[PDB]
Design a protein around this ligand. Structure first.
Ligand SMILES: Cc1cc2nc3c(=O)[nH]c(=O)nc-3n(C[C@H](O)[C@H](O)[C@H](O)COP(=O)(O)O)c2cc1C
Ligand SMILES: NC(=O)c1c[nH]c(C2CC2)n1
Ligand SMILES: NC(=O)c1c[nH]c(C2CC2)n1
Length: 359
């Protein structure tokens, strides 16, 4: 049956309710950036070295000082229990098996503590939104600390939600039995049965809960709040990347939010080199957006990323077979990446160099 990431999406479309598949699939507006996150990878061509001895390929690396089995990690995707009953618990168990890390959404359908209990040995990080209520925000950071999470990925590209047309058409909301489990009030939990207007429920949730005023001053607050490593997630400009470094942050996740926020921004693989150049080696730079194949991972590392994060493929893995489906998606990416390394002449990630790619 399913032998590549595209097969998993096709299967997911066949089993998921339309509103759920559309929520997960969609980009913003006319979905120009959604298409380009994938197309852009195809424009970067590979220049493989031959005869390098690739009998012993070592995919291991490190993310913010923590060892991982491969430079391929799970990105934050909200509300994973829509795809499979075990949701984020399934995901974390698969990451533990693979030896890679899971970035947990602030909008998860499982709590910070539930996920730590399901994956005690898994490398785990918290993706944070800055809520208007700073006490909610602080509690999230404190729970992450207490529960053994190793970094905070602060999302900086979502002062408001992007306009995902299908979610507006479908009047997207959670299924009745589910909630955003990190919160206790009906509104902050995204309770269906609560008034989220007549368009996308999630856009109205964001408008009610998430602070559109945040600024660099709020990054200063967050940097003083926690001594955990903090990564700025959603940076697309070199000037903003230099500002993140100036604020004492510890990495940059080059991201257009899976093309779900501002449509018409560049593909992340295309902006990666500017950002790598701008940070001058001071912090690790990561990528997400459009990673589907081992060669995508290779290209991102050649251009200077430490690791990549995958969003939608993980959700499709859940939709197929929960924990096992996520494990299989990650194993496919791992094997494709191993093969791409070997065929390119790379024994390990340290020798994946800039001469391997040209646009
Ligand atoms: C269904 C879905 C839900 C997401 N939820 C969140 C979220 O809760 N927090 C966040 O910072 N980013 C979220 N993102 C953005 C992802 O972290 C990531 O940037 C993106 O999925 C990467 O692109 P990819 O799906 O092409 O792999 C979401 C993305 C998708 C597709
Ligand atoms: N990729 C497949 O066709 C497939 C079938 N069953 C499974 C389980 C995850 C082990 N994977
Ligand atoms: N924990 C850190 O990596 C870090 C960098 N800069 C600061 C300032 C004291 C706020 N903290």
């Amino acid at each position: 049956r399913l032998i590549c990431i595209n097969d998993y999406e096709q299967h997911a479309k066949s089993v998921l309710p339309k509103s759920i598949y559309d929520y997960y699939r969609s980009g913003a507006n006319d979905e120009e950036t959604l298409a380009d996150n994938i197309a852009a990878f195809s424009r970067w061509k590979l220049y493989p070295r031959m005869l390098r001895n690739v009998a012993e390929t070592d995919l291991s690396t490190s993310v913010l000082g923590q060892r991982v089995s491969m430079p391929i990690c799970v990105g934050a995707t909200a509300m994973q229990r829509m795809a499979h009953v075990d949701g984020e618990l399934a995901t974390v168990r698969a990451c533990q098996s693979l030896g890679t890390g899971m970035m947990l959404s602030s909008w998860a359908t499982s709590s910070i503590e539930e996920v730590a209990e399901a994956g005690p040995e898994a490398l785990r990080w918290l993706q944070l939104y800055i809520y208007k209520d700073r006490e909610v925000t602080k509690k999230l950071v404190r729970q992450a600390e207490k529960m053994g999470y190793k970094a905070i990925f602060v999302t900086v590209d979502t002062p408001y939600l992007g306009n995902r047309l299908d979610d507006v058409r479908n009047r997207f909301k959670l299924p009745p039995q589910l909630r955003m489990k990190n919160f206790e009030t009906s509104t902050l939990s995204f309770s269906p049965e609560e008034n989220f207007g007549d368009d996308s429920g999630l856009a109205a949730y964001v408008a009610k809960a998430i602070d559109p005023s945040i600024s660099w001053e709020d990054i200063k607050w967050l940097r003083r709040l926690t001594s955990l490593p903090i990564v700025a997630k959603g940076i697309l400009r070199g000037d903003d990347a230099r500002e993140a470094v100036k604020h004492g942050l510890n990495g940059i996740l080059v991201s257009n939010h899976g093309a779900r926020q501002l449509d018409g921004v560049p593909a992340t693989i295309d902006v990666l080199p500017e950002i790598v150049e701008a940070v001058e080696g001071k912090v690790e730079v990561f990528l997400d957006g459009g990673v589907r194949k081992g060669t995508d991972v290779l290209k991102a590392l050649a251009l200077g990323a430490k690791a990549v994060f995958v969003g939608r493929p993980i959700v499709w893995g859940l939709a197929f077979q929960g924990e096992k489906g996520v494990q299989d998606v990650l194993e496919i990416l791992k094997e494709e990446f191993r093969l791409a390394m070997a065929l390119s002449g790379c024994q390990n990630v340290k020798v994946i160099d800039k001469t391997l790619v040209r646009k």
